[PDB]
Design an enzyme around this catalytic site. Structure first.
Site, short mmCIF file in Angstrom:
data_model
loop_
_atom_site.label_atom_id
_atom_site.label_comp_id
_atom_site.label_asym_id
_atom_site.label_seq_id
_atom_site.Cartn_x
_atom_site.Cartn_y
_atom_site.Cartn_z
N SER A 200 -132.78 33.54 4.70
CA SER A 200 -133.63 34.68 5.03
C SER A 200 -134.97 34.59 4.29
O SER A 200 -135.68 33.59 4.43
CB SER A 200 -132.88 35.93 4.67
N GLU A 324 -127.99 36.83 14.56
CA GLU A 324 -129.01 37.15 13.58
C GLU A 324 -129.39 38.61 13.52
O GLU A 324 -129.65 39.12 12.44
CB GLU A 324 -130.26 36.29 13.85
N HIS A 437 -126.22 37.99 10.00
CA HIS A 437 -127.24 37.40 9.14
C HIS A 437 -126.68 37.36 7.70
O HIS A 437 -126.28 38.38 7.16
CB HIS A 437 -128.47 38.31 9.19
#
Ligand SMILES: *[C@@H]1O[C@H](CO[C@@H]2O[C@@H](C)[C@@H](O)[C@@H](O)[C@@H]2O)[C@@H](O)[C@H](O)[C@H]1NC(C)=O
Ligand SMILES: *[C@@H]1O[C@H](CO)[C@@H](O)[C@H](O)[C@H]1NC(C)=O
Ligand SMILES: *[C@@H]1O[C@H](CO)[C@@H](O)[C@H](O)[C@H]1NC(C)=O
Lengths: 533, 535
Positions: A200, A324, A437
């Protein structure tokens, strides 16, 4: 006094601690200071190297977590708490951690440096999912992780000013990388083989060290998991950073010098209290204080730099998880919750899109809706929910990753790409969220190898496979096993063939085109749209 | 009379006719060809609405096809059957308002459902006398009464100075309407049931059938409708009054000519001079665009076809609609650089981008770019074969497939019983190259049953396929449902609905039901592109 636990680095002596890993002991040196505490007059300022210390510094415990917002949306829920600080908060937090095999490596070992994510407003190198004992023990890796300033403390900027130049959080990371060059040999790590990896914001950070010349001589390879320097959330312009900074100042009651001087007198929690009130629109996957295109650390926008860079002698591994965007939906989109199946209506979908793509014009938001609607089932709640997730995940991660893979490959880099599709048997988020995610991390770090964590035996074999790909990539720039026919092989990603592999319980499967039609929509059409309309 | 075949003498409102007994594979049929239904629209009548034919004395010979309406004749590929089969097959003349009737021999016992064919040809060509529109097979095998009429095309049928008295526009559509009135009054004399009239047509003929559905005065002249590869809505079937005025005055200038004076000067020009300049008035270089087509006059068409299909009540209407597998291929060799019937037409990306500007002539730069991005295969963006088939798809989707999808949806949502198909069989006898697939117009010879003629060399499976299609069309004409009431075995052809969006594949294999007519792509053309347009 165990001599394997005693090391001397340029600043002085350290004493680590011997830790237990499933297959044996590892040496860990936790909480090593790499900079002067950035407190008081040092808030918002670039980090300064740590002054030498006397005696033996105790490095057997994690140091404090950098001051940051703490999630309260689902109190007591493991799905959120696993990302919350697990040590005391403090602005005095510039410390790094090192794990190495026990006894320490005979010859120089390739080094892996983890840079955590958390939207540039949270995170810490001490979280359980970043535990480096597994990679150290099973693969013999020397693993390093550092704390870097987040939120206002790490990215609040009055561009051009002397006391809040911006990007200090990236400079903290750079200082930790310099520290690794200068000291990692003392632990048996090869400073000539340093691989950065992160997820990320951590991934976007790795991306920013790739694009900033002074960082380039501090690492050789890079891994970006679900994140990129380019894209809608990782950077803001100078003007927007200045705008958010002065709006925050005003909210706490405060010529740049005087504004910053007043900000420096405010207790840390006062700054965090207003962090989230400076975003220009209601949104998700958008963060208040992130890297700023300063014309310094970042000479130009990430987009300009990746379109014109020469990436000849660089190897990169990049990838995404299957869903995601699901995680972010419960943090701001009406209709979504972790507690029900979040079946939404078409009206809630159109509303979600304006929140999911906050910078989108009405025409552009309409284009997104028409592209993502399944015209055979335009009102089906399940389709509309999964679509809202896809819009957010594609816009923020998948397409920005497809874009980066393509430019790096076209411009000389060796690129490998993946899509992680296995959903942890232990996941506490509901099934509709799929593989969210951040949930591939525990596998790359090898947590399933800890029998007490209750992962299936297949997951444990899976994690071993992943640790091998990552460490093979760190050792050689190629994730494939050097001595092993029949696999099949993970091929380089290229603009021509666009090959990438699926990482799941089944053997590697090669696929072509990373959301090709859909990312052409985001990467080629929407840009053309908004720059005219 | 005295020695003539008593089955070939018939009387209609205007007089006595003598038809001819024709041979069909399974037996004889009666044909009445060249029946005048209007006064010759010549001289001071050019551009004027048609007037009913005045009665004649004696027995009018109705044994041969009459003249073809004055039109442009294709010469792009001289001698080629693929283009000649559509060319005039009788003398060209402005005196061309005649219709044809085929009926079983001897004429049916009780009133038979009537099928009325309206040919296509982009509103600038066509004729009811072409071999592919031969009604003898539907008449002999299904006992149908089939009627086809010639209607004025090109300038003669559609040149308009909107609001004027001498060139009101849409007269070719009025010619068709007059022939439908002629059927209401006279078809019973041939054994046809005026209370069961189904209109069918292809391409501009299909758009024509669609315009009769949207024009009140035509509604009481028919009961069911079939639209093959054409619609009244879409980018080519109609023009605005301003555009028609613009094209008409530019044509007048080109031949050397207050509306009355202009029209009066146009009436003095030889028919061939008007044809020679017909193609010089289009606003952009293009394909699938025709100079003189129906105009939104606020009279025949009270509003745009889009407005009318979005707000119409289609309660007691049954409609069968469809497209062929490759609607656009045929059009690419008439104007896109890189395409030819004589080579594989493998093109480059640059040729594709240029082809899109020609294929979507009304598109802005942004819109054309959106088309290219949507149609590009991003895994092989430079592959010539994919770029070629994509160019064909762009043209076919923009002009036929998506306008048909749009029509089916609005008709269905607003009360009509709709049946939809995609025709996918390529005639074994096609003379166009394989890359064109099943081109625009090539389902027709099957619906009319030409494969039943042993001398045309179709395969035996094609002959059985033709019979299947003739049954679907005539069942639909008889009952508003293409399905055979008896046979429950054969899979059923379900109605098309906004909810389920079902349609069938028509090919050698048994009916297969599919869902969504190019649903994603037509959402791009029907919902997104228009909105792009508003900015
Ligand atoms: C295909 O043909 C296009 C037009 O060329 C014409 O037709 C071909 C069959 C020849 O007879 C030639 O003399 C005519 O001018 C070309 O523009 C196109 O590039 C051709 N495709 C290729 C590359 O073979
Ligand atoms: C799910 O829960 C949220 C709040 O708890 C609510 O707003 C939403 O409408 C719910 N959706 C469903 C599936 O009922
Ligand atoms: C049909 O086939 C025969 C035998 O090959 C041939 O002589 C004749 O010309 C063909 N006619 C058509 C319609 O092609």
């Amino acid at each position: 006094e165990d001599p394997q636990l005693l090391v001397r680095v340029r600043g002085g002596q350290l004493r680590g601690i011997r830790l237990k890993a499933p297959g044996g002991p590892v040496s860990a040196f936790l909480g090593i200071p790499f900079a002067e505490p950035p407190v008081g007059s040092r808030r918002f300022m670039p980090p300064e190297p740590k002054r030498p210390w006397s005696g033996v510094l105790d490095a057997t415990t994690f140091q404090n977590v950098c001051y940051q917002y703490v999630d309260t949306l689902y109190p007591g829920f493991e799905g959120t708490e696993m990302w919350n600080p697990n040590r005391e908060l403090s602005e005095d937090c510039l410390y790094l951690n090192v794990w190495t095999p026990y006894p320490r490596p005979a010859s120089p070992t390739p080094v892996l440096i983890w840079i955590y994510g958390g939207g540039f407003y949270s995170g810490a190198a001490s979280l359980d999912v970043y535990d480096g004992r597994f990679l150290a023990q099973v693969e013999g890796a020397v693993l390093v992780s550092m704390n870097y300033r987040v939120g206002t403390f790490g990215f609040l900027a009055l561009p051009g000013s002397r006391e809040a130049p911006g990007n200090v959080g990236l400079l903290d990371q750079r200082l930790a990388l310099q520290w690794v060059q200068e000291n990692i040999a003392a632990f048996g790590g090869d400073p000539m083989s340093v691989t950065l990896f992160g997820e990320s914001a951590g991934a976007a950070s790795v991306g920013m060290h790739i694009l900033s010349l002074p960082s380039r001589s501090l690492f050789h390879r890079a891994v970006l998991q679900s994140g990129t320097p380019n894209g809608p959330w990782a950077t803001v312009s100078a003007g927007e950073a200045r705008r958010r900074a002065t709006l925050l100042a005003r909210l706490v009651g405060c010529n740049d010098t005087e504004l910053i001087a007043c900000l420096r007198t405010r207790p840390a929690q006062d700054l965090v209290d207003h962090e989230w009130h400076v975003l220009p629109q209601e949104s998700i996957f958008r963060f208040s204080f992130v890297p700023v295109v300063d014309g310094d650390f970042l000479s130009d926008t990430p987009e300009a730099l990746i379109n014109t860079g020469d990436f000849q002698d660089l190897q990169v591994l990049v990838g995404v998880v299957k869903d995601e965007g699901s995680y972010f939906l419960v943090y701001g989109v009406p209709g979504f919750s972790k507690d029900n199946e979040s079946l939404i209506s078409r009206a809630q979908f159109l509303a979600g899109v304006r929140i999911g793509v906050p910078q989108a014009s009405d025409l552009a938001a309409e284009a997104v809706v028409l592209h993502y609607t399944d015209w055979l089932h335009p009102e089906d709640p399940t389709h509309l929910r999964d679509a809202m997730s896809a819009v957010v995940g594609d816009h923020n991660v998948v397409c920005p990753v497809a874009q980066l893979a393509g430019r790096l490959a076209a411009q000389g880099a060796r690129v490998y790409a993946y899509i992680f599709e296995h959903r942890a048997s232990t996941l506490t988020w509901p099934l509709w969220m799929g593989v969210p995610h951040g949930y591939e991390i525990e596998f790359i770090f090898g947590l399933p190898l800890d029998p007490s964590l209750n992962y299936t035996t297949e997951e444990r074999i899976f994690a071993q496979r992943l640790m091998k790909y990552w460490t093979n990539f760190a050792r050689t720039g190629d994730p494939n096993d050097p001595r092993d026919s029949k696999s099949p092989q993970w091929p380089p990603y290229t603009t021509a063939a666009q090959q990438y592999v699926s990482l799941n319980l089944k053997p590697l499967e090669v696929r072509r085109g990373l959301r090709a039609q859909t990312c052409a929509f985001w990467n080629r059409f929407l840009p053309k749209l908004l720059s005219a309309t």
